[PDB]
Amino acid sequence: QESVKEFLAKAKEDFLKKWESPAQNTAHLDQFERIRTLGTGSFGRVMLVKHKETGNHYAMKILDKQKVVKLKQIEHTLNEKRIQQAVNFPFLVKLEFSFKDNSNLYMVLEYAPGGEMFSHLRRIGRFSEPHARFYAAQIVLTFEYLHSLDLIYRDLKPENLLIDQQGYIKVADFGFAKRVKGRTWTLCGTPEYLAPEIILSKGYNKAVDWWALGVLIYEMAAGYPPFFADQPIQIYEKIVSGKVRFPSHFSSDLKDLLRNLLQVDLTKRFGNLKNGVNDIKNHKWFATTDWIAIYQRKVEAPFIPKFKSNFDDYEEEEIRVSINEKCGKEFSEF
């Protein structure tokens, strides 16, 4: 408790200085060369690039400014860049550079060579509890960090977790992250992962991330999420019902932890009580977890990637840059 308090107070000082004075326009597209397209997002693509001068590799997220305004995602995109450039933690993807041109926003991000946890999870089916526990522990520590900065993440799911060269997790995509004291209201995130108070238009706080952790651990350990259906509105009905069925292979400790994370009552949800994150860290399902060893990356990982590509292939298309500046006013602080 005594040193964790001073760790977090120094981390908050570091964060606030960058939050109040964000880095802006720290690179240009011509400094980078495309290797391959890594995936696609709501407003554009993610590409693996090499820095021509240094040789370093990065993931470059490209956002079409016109698609962002049209999807009314301007403030979320501004949130995303300002927050991600200001945070620093072992399990968060770093935002190394950002810039814009006439058509697009560019976020040059730390590259995770192991690819998407989503791909690995779907391919193998489900993770063992020890393997799921190893990843869950990194999310617990990351949320403890982020929440101490008054940040809510709001989009925890396998799709947003990457595997690095050591087999550890990196949280990518701050597209819905938000700095708020108190409560917020935006219906956003992914249906399967939405806490009930998001659906019920009640206002909500950082406790929604602890709920999403429950959904994540369940999906890693079961191979499917606790609430699924063909259409989002049927998913929402199961979420507010407050009924979870567990596979028979789930341990009692796992079921107990999940009942306390997938807790509809905010005054009872783990992570939201007087002891905060310590109710999670001291839960019996985490009995084998050395929390400091996880933070220091001294624990053996469930699997190590092998760099040479069993990653997904995408068609390579040109990055179109209009001769006329688009949406300049909306994105002036980016």
Partner: peptide
């Protein structure tokens, strides 16, 4: 099985987040 029902659903690929 629950797993078969999931695999037969339309929501086993990368899931879009709702913006609104």
């Amino acid at each position: 099985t629950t797993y078969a029902d999931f695999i037969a659903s339309g929501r086993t690929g990368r899931r879009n987040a709702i913006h609104d």
